[model samples]
Target: TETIMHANDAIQKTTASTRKPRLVVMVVGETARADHASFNGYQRATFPHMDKLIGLGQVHNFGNVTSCGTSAAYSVPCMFSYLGAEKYDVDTADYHENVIDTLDRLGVAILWRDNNSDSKGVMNRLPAKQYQDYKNSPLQGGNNTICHTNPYDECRDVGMLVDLDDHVKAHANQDILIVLHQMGNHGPAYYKRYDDEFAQFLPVCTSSELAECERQTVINAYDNALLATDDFLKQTIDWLAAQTHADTAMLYLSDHGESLGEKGVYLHGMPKAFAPKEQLSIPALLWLGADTPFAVANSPTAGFSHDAITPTLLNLFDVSTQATADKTAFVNPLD
Candidate 1:
């Protein structure tokens, strides 16, 4: 009875009166910092492709965004959960109702493609696929086709693209949500995040021990990973441009930021109370198709954090919260 009521409410909230199909491809970025992205005023040209997207009026770079937690284990679940940073408890979040679960309940076509180890159980109830599954699937057309060199390594973020394309096409008739969990800049081995062709920055940090390398080398490798992310996102935008069946949008944001030897810190995972600015400051960008229904501004909106993600997405689905009386909904003050 409880489950039925939840499902009923979700449908009532999410179904549009016009009945037009909507498809959202949300790229869950790994350890990327806003300071490294050119869109965020970085000096380097790390995001050339995305810059072009912005020029064509396809992108909106949200600034001053912060993460919920400093580590993947904590941040991933927190970002997906209803709990915000101030009151987040990992144990409670583990069993909390999340955005993905609500979307699934609403009968939206949901798929999660991950290059990382898992979705941190955020998509555990939905249709989920891993990068390793792609190589074995018939879609690849044959066996022994290695999608990447390091199967154990999480740096092969592009490996999830084929599956993402397939799922979007397969569910084109319905309101769909595809989550692409990337391995963006998640390292000590930042150099492994991209192929050699994307090594645009020189003298990169090749070692897994990031502390061993010079600061510039580490920054270079991280910048190169950012470049690769730019290419991946552009590839996604181009694919959406070609699709005519559904209204599409892509939202990209880092799970948390990384510390590139800033103030003697090398990686994320510090306690939230003491985490420095580099570890909390993340990058977020949204690319809406020309026909997208939601209204978004061209300039950056301040005061957005991981907590705002769920409510904003729910709002996008045209879900009404007046009856539910949920107060966590983050109203964009700038908008």
Candidate 2:
């Protein structure tokens, strides 16, 4: 005999009642510019993966993130503040809270997987688990003391990728939001940063700083990384799609962009007040799974802001409370 307790009993009977369609896999490209890729019509197929995503989704070619110009310490906090606090700058915003705080309050699983040094520390104050400074870990997952000296080992991202796989899969049963940060294109050693096989051009530039040919060199290395990132993301998305218990989506945004040899600057970290398109603009994306009714692949609204990321995710997950309901969904990027 099956006796129904009540509407509440029916809700508790199926896990789907509590499940939601949400995941934020952000690939924060450090020191990358918007125009370095052929996708931007730069003549180099620098972003085959991103191009595909754009074709499959939306491209806010004119979208602008209000940044103080130059450096993550200045810009990322502003972007991160989008999740909860209303301030535009980190200094004005409450330092101890962010979207993670809200998510934690709601029993939402939050994961911040980082590939850059001190990146985990960026969100250390948050309620999420931080996987920090893993580039120097040994093959067995033990810390490699050598990592401290030479952190830019090319395989750092590879290690980060593997670890991310392990963590997400092991916890796929839970309603989760994962943010993966990559130390993309943070360069001075451009030539050695990626696999030499992707080295499509001629002799590499010897100058550490941007020269006449430095931009191309750095661009090539960054593009190579982007290629790897494409594969990494596709693989991650594939896995998310395969999971039956949960619906998933991914969003990628850069902390800030970089300047090549353009305008006499060799890399990012300049004052935003004097930023060129290279540093001011960035490559960003939003992707959804087949199950989500909200796809923005064919949307016409432009000028999407980074400020909308938090509220959108919250809404997607059916967790949009009064505090998070005001987030701008803007134009659907995958319409």
Candidate 3:
């Protein structure tokens, strides 16, 4: 009974049931630089959990992914839609069905638990129940372990998994695709993102204002945020491995890379053409279940970006459609 518009086949069709329950958890990361991730060969072990999995052949990190934009407002929606970066116009993206909406039409149960500012209209066209804004609700449901130091202000990313098990268990007989939007490495105040235990990197810039910290101090705090992300991913992957109701898989892609003191650019700035490499090159990866019968066929290369997310998910789920989108990877590759 909502005002549904746009493409025809987005909801005009449905696919057959899977042989067994299948669950795919997509984690959308914030402001993480590819260079900070150990999986991409950073000197510092920023993402230790994912690094361990890569060695064990359980994870594949696609290095140097050029994102749609250097900021979340643009990259977030761009990655969610079929429209590639060049064609994704922010002025009017509402009419088109995003990857989540498209996948739901194909008989996949969808859940979006966002801890970030918002979905940026990614799930607006869908049912309200399907979207969970943790920033707003805080502790509406799930486990109440109190991950954030100040829950009234902001909860840590781990809160996304609180009632996640119960949520996943509800759709036992059907296929599910859940999204966890991480507030990973986002900041002017990176100090607030993690707990004391993950503050392994010393000499952190405790001041919320970036002007107070020197370059090295700021990096120390940012790296500490990455460490928190590392712990969260470790717990998330371990949780997926424990799932018995379905064959599981995890796909992670940071919305856009962050800007440090590189070239004197504080945060993110000028357009994509003028922006430094640090702002556009993001980290993307996949980790399949131990015995899920799925294998990562794509290699870690320089030519991928936010554009690959939609088509990649479609290919993974076996959703066949040519009415509104194509299988092309709509991004430039680095040589």
Candidate 4:
């Protein structure tokens, strides 16, 4: 741990404007497709909450964003790695430092709450006080924390937000970044994502076995799952706004997109060369409180991808490193 800390000692807050208390919530969505969202002109209003925020000029929907990998195993870690998809080698990554590690050293009070089965080794190097996962939940499902074997992958994305307002006010003077890792649209069994309250679309698929359901049923299930996500995000922002302790902001990006019978493909994980846009085009959203130093991007990004994350984060949090900054990183306008 000492060696890791020493190597990252250079990552301290450099910008005078960010010396004050600030809070940024980074939500990593799973298996969410970009084109399906209303912000991108889908017929259905899949992102109602965020759409309302966008409409009111409170949130910015980053259209035309793409993920580095088609599935979680590759994309999750890759999303946070300074190594973009092209150069990211899973084997060599085991020894490399990620953006999160640097942020911790920068004096940001970090918290990672995951509804997903794993952190994908992202939080492994952090102290126990800085992370929370499956073991912390009483939601009740499979006991296997890493990956569940149940036929239905019983899960709830909102379960990650159980106690937020009380969790952070005490750290009032420090910059905080709470990472909410979601099982956004993790499928075959999309019915487990929400209660019937979010089932706005009719005739949804109820089983993990997608083969048993028609293509339309599969789409509805996925859409319904996203509805739950939209509400979850809205609730997250509401929680952020409820607190007066920090200058708040939220940046949400999906690790990868999913396929719902698109050209007969139903799930993610296909090799990138053979993957369809439905499996690569993911969405990114941003919302900042009145006091944040950065402004929304002009067009979200000039051709965005997961590769832009680390740089975007460095710029957002007001810390830069020539060693790890990538030119492809998306830059937000500074106020």
Candidate 5:
């Protein structure tokens, strides 16, 4: 009850600028680690698509970013909160008003398109449509246009693209924020994350019991999931490129990370005191199109974490305040 009231109060105070029409697509990734990314210097070519974008100066990958928690239940809410990693508390994160609420309050149309089950209450007050809704909707396209639909199964990350295109078109004339929550690298079922075309890694573990599988097999399955994520991101960038009415930008961040048979740990959610670097370290990538008002920072040592997301977003919308300034840790001064 208090959280809703607080959200309402914050909503009343937020106001959108009359600047050029802007759209920010924030893609929330699942169970991805920095070390697995080819751009992050992994030996394997796990990111064939991302490598091309980086060379073209279109994608900026943040290597030193850390997640706020080791699971979606914690990371999702904490990353959206102003308290951030250092000052984060579970109770506060559960009841607090976050950047999404502020964006909605300011008259910026906000939409959450989730393929996953949990949003951690961040999109509670805003319009959120699930993959199932998309599946049942009239806009659901045929097999040629849509991809990855297992027999009697829901559409994977690629399925969200269908909804994204429509959502962006519908709100083309306003300042909009679209959140695409992906099913990236969710463990134990890595075999199901991607379709047959992405099965580049051979002899992957298909069973949920990861402990019984060989280490190389586990890694192969995991890397395949990474490859799938790369393709989805590439598709998203290409979609944004085709848009003209709005200056579009995309930001991707993984919620926590996974440990592949390292130190007897299989998945995330270990206590912070005992959690390994694989679980704490995450990957964040940003792409600001030529028409966008935002710019990437030149200082690699500026030190960014999930806490800075709210302030950076506010900056993207050209909404400034003392609180936003104090909370923001990373932003290109030249912008």
Candidate 6:
């Protein structure tokens, strides 16, 4: 048997011409804010690849999502609920609703790879599952106390991508939906999460309060994580463009944003009324393959949210749609 594979380009095979076969990769970054990235004109240059994709697909000017701060113990169920479901309304979430279930109902295969904290216990609840238990779970070992001893010590985000690539290569011929959850900018030890090159700030902030000094330290760490995320995303997008059985598209969104020692809040979970843009507004981007006409369109100027996610993928996949598109679906620049 040959180890290499090649496409049959010699013959122009006639088949379906209207729809493009899809391979969807949905990435979830943890505790990230929109204001720190280069795509959002953040002075820190946190996202290099995302900055370039701004014109490749619709960039929703206003994209909001549900947030209960620290990975709401209920996050797993909340994310799977049908799109347009009242985001914060937990009363009706008894039934499981998620992207995979919707896609599966439409005949699309699903895989979930989580890089942080047992995927916040989310993927386990999904019907079609590919769960990876990270070696460094904060819950089991209690914060990997030695995380500061060596920088770059296998963050959950890194583990998520690792599992993702493995899953893709392992099953390359199917129309699959893969979800990744990164152990993103979640931190109190800002100085250790990233390597030194991205740390362009000085003094390292001797304090831990919301004062200017402490704030800068947190920013330095979080921004550095964005830089890492940017690199991972670029690779993922390139992979999509090269895959043969599928036309690929990727969307990167965060579960919620973090507070950089602001108003004595070191991380997220503040009341919504007090939640700043740093907590509410997050960077949402899409990268379309060359085959997709979406790149030729203008960026979306209307509002979008997590609710539109399931329908969008289902639409892109050409699956049957008993699932209804959210009101915000047509509101996006991509819509």
- Would you estimate the TM-scores of all the predictions? 0.86, 0.76, 0.88, 0.88, 0.88, 0.74
Instruction: At residue 140, give the lDDT of candidate 3.
Output: 57
**Top-TM-score candidate index:** 3
lDDT of each: 0.72, 0.54, 0.76, 0.76, 0.74, 0.56
lDDT tens readout by residue for model 2, 120-200: 234665543444444446663533333332334444454454545565566555556676666666666665555544556
- Residue runs of model 2 more than 4 Å from their true location after superposition: 1-16, 53-68, 83-86, 91-96, 120-122, 126-130, 139-152, 163-165, 169-172, 212-215, 297-302, 324-326, 330-335
User: 1-335, model 3: which lDDT tens digit per residue?
Assistant: 24233333443222325355678888999999888888888899898888989999888777788888887787888888877798898767766778877777666889888888778898887798988876544365532255447633567788788768787667767778889899888888888888888888889887866765788889999999999998988888989998865677788888888888776677764488788889888888888786665555444355677877886666556555663354443221111
C-alpha lDDT of candidate 2 relative to the true structure: 0.54
Of candidates 3 and 1, the better by TM-score: 3
Query: What clash count goes with each model?
Result: 0, 9, 1, 0, 0, 6
Which model, 1 or 5, shows the larger lDDT? 5
Using lDDT as the yardstick, the better of models 3 and 5 is 3
Candidate 1: misplaced stretches above 4 Å?
1-8, 12-17, 127-146, 149-155, 163-165, 297-302, 322-335
- Error (Å) of candidate 1 at residue 86 is 1.9
By TM-score, rank the candidates, best first: 3, 4, 5, 1, 2, 6
Please tell me which model should have the higher TM-score, number 2 or number 5: 5
Q: Write down the RMSD of candidate 4 (Cα, Å).
A: 3.9
lDDT of 1 at 169: 61
Comparing 2 with 4 on TM-score, the higher-scoring candidate is 4
Alpha carbon deviation, residue 183, candidate 3 (Å): 0.9
The predicted structure with the larger lDDT, 1 or 4, is 4
Q: How far is candidate 3 from the true structure (C-alpha RMSD, Å)?
A: 4.2
lDDT tens string, model 5, 1-335? 55633333332222334445777888889999988998889899998988888888888888757888898888888877777777777765767778877777676788666666557778776654422332332345322234335543545777677746666667655788777888788877788878778899999998889999898899999999899899999988888887766777888989888899888789889877789989977788888777566667543355567877887677666554455544544454223
Stronger candidate by lDDT (1 vs 2): 1
